[PDB]
Every structure is written in C-alpha cells, then in structure tokens.
Design a protein around this nucleic acid. Sequence first.
DNA 1: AACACTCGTCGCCCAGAGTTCACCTTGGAGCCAGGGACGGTTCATTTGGGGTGCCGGAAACGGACGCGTACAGGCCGTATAATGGGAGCTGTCACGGATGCA
Length: 59
Amino acid sequence: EDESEALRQARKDAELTASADSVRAYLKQIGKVALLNAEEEVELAKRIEAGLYATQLMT
DNA sequence: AACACTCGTCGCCCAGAGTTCACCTTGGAGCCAGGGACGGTTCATTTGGGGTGCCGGAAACGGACGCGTACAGGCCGTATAATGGGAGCTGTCACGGATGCA
C-alpha cells in the first residue's frame, strides 16, 4: 500500500521517465516546486529588496 | 387537123470614154543678201532694307532653405483573485536490421 517500500519506488521510477514530449517534460519539471502564500511571498519580497539595496551599496 | 403571119439574134457600122502618149508654160521652193530691234547679257548705282550684340531692366521662374505639422510605429503601464492542453485516430506489406530487453 503506502508504507514498507510499496509505492515509493514506483513514484521514483515514474519520476525517472523520458517524457519525450517537451510540453509534458516542462510540466513535470514545473511540478517539483510547492505553491506559496501571502506570508512566503512577502518575506521573499523583503529578501529581494535587501539584495537590491546591498547591490546598490556595493556599486 | 389544115393553113398563112411577126419576133431575138446576130452581125456590122459609126461616134466618143477616157486613157495613153505626149507637146508647151509659170508659179514656183528655196538659196542667198541685207537690215533691224531685241532680248539676253553685263555692269554702274541706291539707298530701302535686313541685322545684331548687348543690356537697363522688368518680370517670370526655378529652386533652395528654414521651419512648422502629421500619422506610424514603438514603448509602457493597467493591483479581488483569477496557479499543470485538448485531440488524435490510428484497416499496408514487404522486410532488414537495430534495438531495448532477454
């Protein structure tokens, strides 16, 4: 079923697939990153603002 | 069936058709001689006329020259939330060989 090495190897072998169609391959590759929410996006904005400010300072 | 009359045909004889043969004239046909005027030529004028190169300049005219306007195309931004495609139709066969699995 779910545990005892039952379907994890199936998921791994599924992810290790050619997927010769480029659109399907792109969808597979885009599938590996989780969605965000309001909090995560706002602190990401804080981080990029800090990076831009530091880059301007070094310039 | 018996009986007593008038008409082509030819020759011949004399005069001219018109034709030839053969005689005198006279208007020549042209041949040349002489004299214009004449039209073709040439050369004097004769100033009536064509002519002109350039310009003051007046006006067109061709274009430059500077400066406005005009859409065409390009860049740019829109703050609720909106977080993984439809569709494709696929009856071949031969068959050599690689090829992903045996």
